[PDB]
């Protein structure tokens, strides 16, 4: 029935097309699994045991990574007044009973995942791999740190759990390779940036020693390097230069010129470079993906010929199309695609195919023809009861007006909830959960499970959906109604006036899970530093606190006293909304100026990753939507 | 001796090459001046009288445009307590004696400039031109508004003086054509932006009616459209949602998600479109410049042939090269540049050149060969005294080691001023002005005046230089020293690690006088509205003032009470440094909510002009520096 498990046959024609399939969605086979003379050994039976059991790991990888808000402050134990939540968080900290029990679950599924591939690698290959060397070394640190915390330094567990989580998921590991290639270009331009403040912190220190400014703010030199740095951010534009503006108006024409050159040229010209190297790293990554295509299709070509003369005949290629489980038609499609595929010299009558010549053909059936779909029938015991009865169900759903009725009836679904909100006031709340699950139970069986996972954001829907079922067993549904109308703006994207915008903006939701995943990881590093470095300062009873800007502006909850409060407090520093409130606080709270180098180290690293990974990527991928909108209507007219 | 004035001869070969010169720097000749059968009539004698006398107009155009800070508040006359400078400016307002005297100068040189091209256009052409029609109509309003002031409404003079000044200078007029072509794309995407606030102002109004938030901030719906708009700017990130964060921590996950989608996607996806249409408007402007090349070189081709059979012979083309007066020796360089120019007809062997074929040749001598230089000798009475003696001078300066000694001895020039600063404490200040003018008096005589004007930013230097001489006749020299070391960072751009950055940043100083000129003009519109609309509100003795954020944050010097205080207040609103202090003030000072639509109109219009004309242009022009750096080393190796 299916095409999933078949690595045990894997004939001349059987799994050879699935090798050609792995160019299409580009799944990975390890090069050693491609290296073998059989290339389908007992090792590879274990390899496909991973990619079926993969989503077990995201109930580890996210599970390990989100442990860190649930953990304690570093220092409640020296403290007095412990259990007072003076500005702390709301999640309960897991005590040493609940500490260790969560971690035996965690270090199990690591060791299964990390010592998985020796099932399909040689030990001299596993233990040689520099990527693998780090992840095993990151295991043992946790494997130590679990065992030490049982019997019971600054506790470097939670720095590692990020770096396991970065290296584990292939998006975040692919992403981070760029910031080895970008970083050699970014750091050289940073020396030219760092020069721009220093040159222009020097003049305004020199210029305003004489006036009221050096009496007030610009006392030290490094108290101008501090201040004219904050003007480069412009979260401080009038408050810096009031007493230079108040005395003579002609000091604005300095500061309105420095900020102007600072923001509107340089922070574009940092963006210009970081957008320029991102172009060159993206292709160098992409051509690093197509050698994985060519080193797959070489295996797809080398599996065919036994003589390995370098050539496959047309019927020898048509028998691939017959073993393709093909679309519906094969009389002359290769004969149709002879000249249509870019170049054939057509020397011999049919049987002139080179190793390069095939690599266009499997991509052409992927791009234009879109031939294949995996049924994935059943497990074999209830199958025939349901395989007959599915033809009385899945006749209904595969009818596309009913598929439009999946869009049409989804309009009805949110309409009842508005009036029912008031009238439930004038459990009953769990009753409407049954209506929500019902529509999504249908198309799972129509599609198939990973066929449901291949769908765009309906993938993301069932991610939301089951937790809604889980969250009701342990009001909010009112605010959770909005996800239904959220996909009705996916009917806005067919509007031609507003197309290439929402063509981007919906495509850019899966396109920025890596590059916004990494930024979430960088915060989980910077928070865990702020927990350890800046932990217990903002007290109830601190008297150096209340004269600082966190008290006047009342941002006391934006605080590093725990982990999750520091997790939000990084976010405003990431946004640049009044981010100097914290920087001028902790220069007074820790009391010395080495705390300043925390937040600048945030800025230099964030305004790579913002100017790179968010901002510069959209201006690429909008152009991918744009020309594929234009060259759909161009080659809708052209050929 | 000279090559300037020669439109009175203009032989078959004489001014014909100067037609080919007018493709090189691309100066403009009007199409009617190209239309004529003579094309060098008595009209065109007056046309070159303009472009020599052009810099007389910038002592009008800047003169007219900078008049507006020197003028009065709209309303001191109803007021009590006039001559108290309660938060006012510092420039003296020109009284009605000095008001009119400045304007007879001004309306003279307009009328000379505006009724100039009747000297070279027909009356049915001058008065048909709608680009001319507006400027004449803008004259008469000022011609009225001067005469009304002499014989003693809201005084719409100063709106016009900008719009004369925009249409007068060809940079600002070329720029503004784009924002007719961009605006049809920008406004359609704005309706999708405007939708994003409204959709998401609606939820947080709905979501937080129940909690503390709707008690505090989110009372009205339109008081969330107000606030969630300011979160789109993020000049207000924690202060908006404290009491939604203070009560339940889980309401940050709204706001940290809304801002995230708001800033990092949409304000890139406004930038992506506005950078995309700027690409398409720039080329459409540029191909609008090359038809001006082709409709010049058609005149350059049509002036040659008397039979107009369509062909020019090789010697008939070589006699251009002899008349060109730009190379050393020319026996077979046409024969060198035959096949080197992309395609030759070569039919009737040396003599078959099409109208298209020449257009590469005139561009090739400008680009690659580049042997033109205009001598511009003297006026004819002191000429031979100096022209003989210049060969005893300009033997020195055109020697390239002395040209490096213009770079080398300029390094010495700033060094003495640091120690001399302290020792002048222990007029003498005007003595060091003589050293500064001296070095720039040299190369002018070596180059020539407009030859000095063709230079990159040394052009800008003499603009600085003479006002220094003027400003000393009517301390600051210390801060004026810095312009010498300012050009030593032009010896940093030859460093290969930092080249393509400063290749941009120095080329982008002339490249953003238009697109930062327009933004300067938009403020002079918005200030003049703020003078008239928001003029006299911020009193000394206002009692609704001191409880507002302009008093607490103490930005009281940033009113638009006068003109130039509102010129600078618009700067901070352009930067986005605490710009909601003003918006929440003037909603209390004028007291009703129509003042809000002032500052949003400043946002929507400027965050086109920032995201367009500043930001998106740099990411183009950095790529122009980048590939011309690469394809200098590529075709330094290739051909
Ligand atoms: C707080 C909870 C966060 C929830 C976010 C859920 C994201 C769902 C991802 C689940 C899939 C795990 C696969 C990731 C890597 C393994 C292989 C692979 O390449 O799959 C690619 C996967 C699709 O490929 P396939 O499913 O393997 O076929 O693409 C993705 O969508 C996920 C890529 C990165 C996911 C982790 C990074 C982001 C997580 C943290 C987010 C924090 C805040 C972000 C705010 C942005 C708001 C817009
Ligand atoms: C406050 C005083 C501002 C001083 C700025 C000086 C501006 C230089 C003007 C040069 C002479 C006037 C020519 C412009 C009219 C078009 C004719 C032409 O082709 O010349 C183009 C000229 C070069 O071409 P050429 O000299 O004719 O060969 O290019 C330019 O450099 C000037 C182009 C626009 C000038 C007016 C717009 C800007 C003025 C307002 C500045 C305020 C904001 C600037 C802040 C940014 C800081 C980095
Ligand atoms: C590079 C851009 C990355 C975006 C920055 C991180 C976003 C901040 C989110 C975490 C902090 C809020 C947690 C509040 C905890 C508390 O104070 O109780 C955060 C990420 C959410 C996932 C998608 C957003 C980007 C975590 C949200 C969890 C909320 C927990 C609140 C507890 C509720 C209770 O009362 O128990
Ligand atoms: C879109 C961004 C445009 C950038 C240009 C901005 C100004 C740069 C320098 C121009 C200076 C003009 C001086 C004219 C003299 C006068 O009218 O006062 C600039 C645009 C803001 C974005 C605005 C800032 C200019 C403010 C000038 C104030 C000087 C007042 C001095 C009076 C007191 C005295 O001289 O004694
Ligand atoms: C581009 C650099 C040029 C100007 C460089 C400025 C470096 C000056 C360093 C001085 C540091 C502090 C000076 C006075 C304060 C003190 O005595 O410590
Ligand atoms: C990247 C440029 C600056 C980065 C962070 C700003 C550093 C400015 C210097 C800090 C304060 C100056 C030294 C204090 C003087 C003192 O000890 O009295
Ligand atoms: C990689 C490091 C980045 C650069 C860090 C900036 C180092 C300069 C620190 C400035 C301190 C100068 C203040 C001394 C003057 C004084 O205290 O009187
Ligand atoms: C993923 C890499 C980890 C990043 C580097 C972490 C170590 C840098 C500084 C750590 C602590 C610095 C301050 C310690 C002072 C203290 O504990 O009181
Ligand atoms: C990675 C770039 C970070 C840049 C910021 C560096 C922090 C420098 C701190 C400057 C403080 C001045 C030195 C005196 C220290 C002290 O007085 O305690
Ligand atoms: C991607 C990881 C980046 C890591 C850089 C962050 C570490 C720089 C500063 C951390 C805290 C140092 C300042 C603490 C001052 C103190 O000891 O009191
Ligand atoms: C995308 C739009 C969907 C939601 C649109 C929300 C429009 C609601 C309009 C209500 C305005 C004020 C409502 C209560 C205040 C009043 O009674 O005036
Ligand atoms: C572009 C989106 C918004 C633009 C400016 C914000 C408009 C907010 C609405 C004004 C405040 C509330 C309206 C009146 C309420 C009242 O009169 O009580
Ligand atoms: C081109 C115009 C842009 C759109 C301008 C905003 C239009 C909506 C104004 C919001 C007012 C709604 C407030 C009414 C609710 C109330 O006062 O109770
Ligand atoms: C260059 C175009 C000019 C811009 C438009 C100018 C007129 C728009 C509004 C002008 C005044 C606004 C209302 C005046 C109220 C008052 O005078 O009290
Ligand atoms: C050009 C776009 C500007 C958008 C801002 C529009 C200003 C709308 C003002 C909203 C105020 C609510 C209406 C009530 C007026 C009043 O009470 O005086
Ligand atoms: C490029 C020119 C843009 C012109 C747009 C600015 C005019 C919009 C609002 C001007 C002031 C209107 C608000 C004043 C309300 C009042 O009279 O109190
Ligand atoms: Ca073979
Ligand atoms: Ca054939
Ligand atoms: Ca900001
Ligand atoms: Ca001829
Ligand atoms: Ca020839
Ligand atoms: Ca304050």
Curated annotation (Swiss-Prot), chains A, B:
Gene Ontology cellular-component terms listed: cytosol; Golgi apparatus; monoatomic ion channel complex; plant-type vacuole; plasma membrane; vacuolar membrane; vacuole
Activity control, per UniProt: Inhibited by Al(3+).
Topological domain ranges for the Vacuolar compartment: 72-99, 210-215, 231-252, 526-562, 578-598
Residue span, EF-hand domain: 292-327, 333-368
Cytoplasmic side, ranges: 121-137, 170-188, 274-398, 448-459, 494-504
InterPro entries named in the record: EF-hand-dom_pair, EF_hand_dom, Ion_trans_dom, TPC1_plant, Volt_channel_dom_sf
UniProt GO MF annotations: calcium ion binding; identical protein binding; voltage-gated calcium channel activity
Keywords: Acetylation, Calcium, Calcium channel, Calcium transport, Ion channel, Ion transport, Membrane, Repeat, Transmembrane, Transmembrane helix, Transport, Vacuole, Voltage-gated channel
Pfam family, one: Ion_trans
Intramembrane region list: 216-230, 563-577
Signal peptide annotation: none
Topological category with respect to the lipid bilayer: Multi-pass membrane protein
Consequence of gene disruption: Plants display an impairment of both the Ca(2+) inhibition of stomatal guard cell opening and abscisic acid (ABA) inhibition of seed germination.
SUPFAM superfamilies hit by this protein: EF-hand (SSF47473), Voltage-gated potassium channels (SSF81324)
Segments of skewed composition (Basic and acidic residues): 633-639
Cell compartment(s), UniProt: Vacuole membrane
A GO BP annotation: regulation of jasmonic acid biosynthetic process
Subunit structure: Homodimer.
Protein function: Functions as a voltage-gated inward-rectifying Ca(2+) channel (VDCC) across the vacuole membrane. Is one of the essential components of the slow vacuolar (SV) channel. Acts as the major ROS-responsive Ca(2+) channel and is the possible target of Al-dependent inhibition. Involved in the regulation of germination and stomatal movement.
Protein family (similarity comment): Belongs to the calcium channel alpha-1 subunit (TC 1.A.1.11) family. Two pore calcium channel subfamily.
Domain commentary: Each of the two internal repeats contains five hydrophobic transmembrane segments (S1, S2, S3, S5, S6) and one positively charged transmembrane segment (S4). S4 segments probably represent the voltage-sensor and are characterized by a series of positively charged amino acids.
Protein name per Swiss-Prot or TrEMBL: Two pore calcium channel protein 1
Organism of provenance: Arabidopsis thaliana
Gene name in the database record: TPC1
């Amino acid at each position: 029935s299916e095409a999933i498990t078949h690595g045990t046959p894997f004939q001349k024609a059987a799994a050879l097309v699935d090798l050609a399939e792995d160019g299409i969605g580009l799944p990975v086979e390890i090069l050693d699994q491609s290296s073998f003379g059989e290339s389908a050994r007992y090792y590879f039976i274990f390899t496909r045991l991973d990619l079926i059991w993969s989503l077990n790991y995201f109930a580890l990888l996210f599970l390990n990574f989100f442990e860190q808000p649930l953990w304690c402050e570093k220092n409640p134990k020296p403290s007095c007044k412990d259990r007072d939540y003076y500005y702390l968080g709301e999640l309960p900290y897991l005590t040493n009973a609940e500490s260790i029990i969560y971690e035996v679950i965690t270090l199990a599924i690591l060791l299964v995942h990390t010592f998985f591939p020796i099932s399909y690698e040689g030990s001299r290959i596993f233990w040689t791999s520099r990527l693998n060397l780090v992840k095993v070394a990151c295991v043992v640190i946790l494997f130590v740190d679990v065992l030490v915390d049982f019997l019971y330094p600054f506790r470097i567990a939670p720095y590692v759990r990020v770096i396991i989580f970065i290296l584990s998921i292939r998006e975040l590991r692919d992403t981070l390779v760029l910031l080895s290639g970008m970083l050699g270009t970014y750091l050289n331009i940073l020396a030219l940036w760092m020069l721009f403040l220093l040159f222009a912190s020097w003049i305004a220190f020199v210029m305003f020693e004489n006036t009221q400014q050096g009496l007030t703010v610009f006392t030290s030199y490094g108290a101008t390097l501090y201040q004219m740095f904050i003007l480069f951010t412009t979260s401080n534009n009038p408050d810096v230069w009031i007493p230079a503006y108040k005395s003579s108006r002609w000091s604005s024409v300095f500061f309105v010129l420095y900020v102007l050159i600072g923001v509107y040229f340089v922070t574009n010209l940092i963006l210009a470079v970081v957008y320029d190297s991102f172009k060159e790293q993206l292709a160098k990554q992409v051509s690093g993906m197509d050698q994985m295509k060519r080193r797959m299709l070489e295996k797809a070509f080398g599996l065919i010929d036994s003589d390995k003369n370098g050539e496959i005949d047309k019927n020898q290629c048509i028998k691939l199309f017959e073993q393709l489980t093909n679309y519906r038609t094969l009389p002359k499609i290769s004969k149709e695609e002879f000249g249509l595929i870019f170049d054939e010299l057509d020397d011999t009558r049919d049987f002139k195919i080179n190793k390069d010549e095939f690599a266009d053909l499997c991509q052409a059936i992927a791009l234009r023809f879109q031939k294949e779909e995996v049924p994935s029938l059943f497990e074999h015991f209830p199958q025939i009861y349901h395989s007959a009865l599915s033809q009385q169900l899945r006749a209904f759903v595969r009818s596309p007006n009913f598929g439009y009725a999946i869009s049409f009836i989804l309009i009805i679904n949110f309409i009842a909830v508005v009036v029912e909100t008031t009238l439930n006031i004038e459990v009953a709340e769990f009753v409407f959960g049954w209506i929500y699950v019902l529509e999504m139970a249908l198309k799972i069986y129509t599609y198939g499970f990973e066929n449901y996972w291949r769908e765009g954001a309906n993938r993301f829907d069932f991610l939301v959906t089951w937790v809604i079922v889980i969250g009701e067993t342990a009001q909010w549904i009112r605010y959770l109604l909005l996800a239904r109308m959220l996909r009705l703006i996916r009917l806005l994207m067919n509007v031609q006036r507003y197309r290439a915008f929402i063509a981007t903006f919906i495509t850019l939701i899966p396109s920025l899970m890596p590059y916004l995943g990494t930024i979430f990881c960088v915060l989980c590093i910077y928070c865990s530093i702020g927990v350890q470095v800046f932990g217990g300062l903002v007290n109830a009873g601190n008297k150096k606190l209340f004269e600082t800007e966190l008290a006047e502006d009342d941002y006391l909850l934006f605080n590093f006293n725990d982990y999750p409060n520091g997790m939000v407090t990084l976010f405003n520093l990431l946004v640049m909304g009044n981010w100097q409130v914290w920087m001028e606080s902790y220069k007074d709270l820790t009391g010395t100026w080495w705390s300043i180098t925390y937040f600048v180290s945030f800025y230099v690293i964030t305004i790579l990753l913002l100017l790179n990974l968010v901002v510069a990527f959209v201006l690429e991928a909008f152009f991918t939507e744009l020309d594929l909108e234009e060259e759909e209507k161009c080659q809708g007219q052209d050929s």
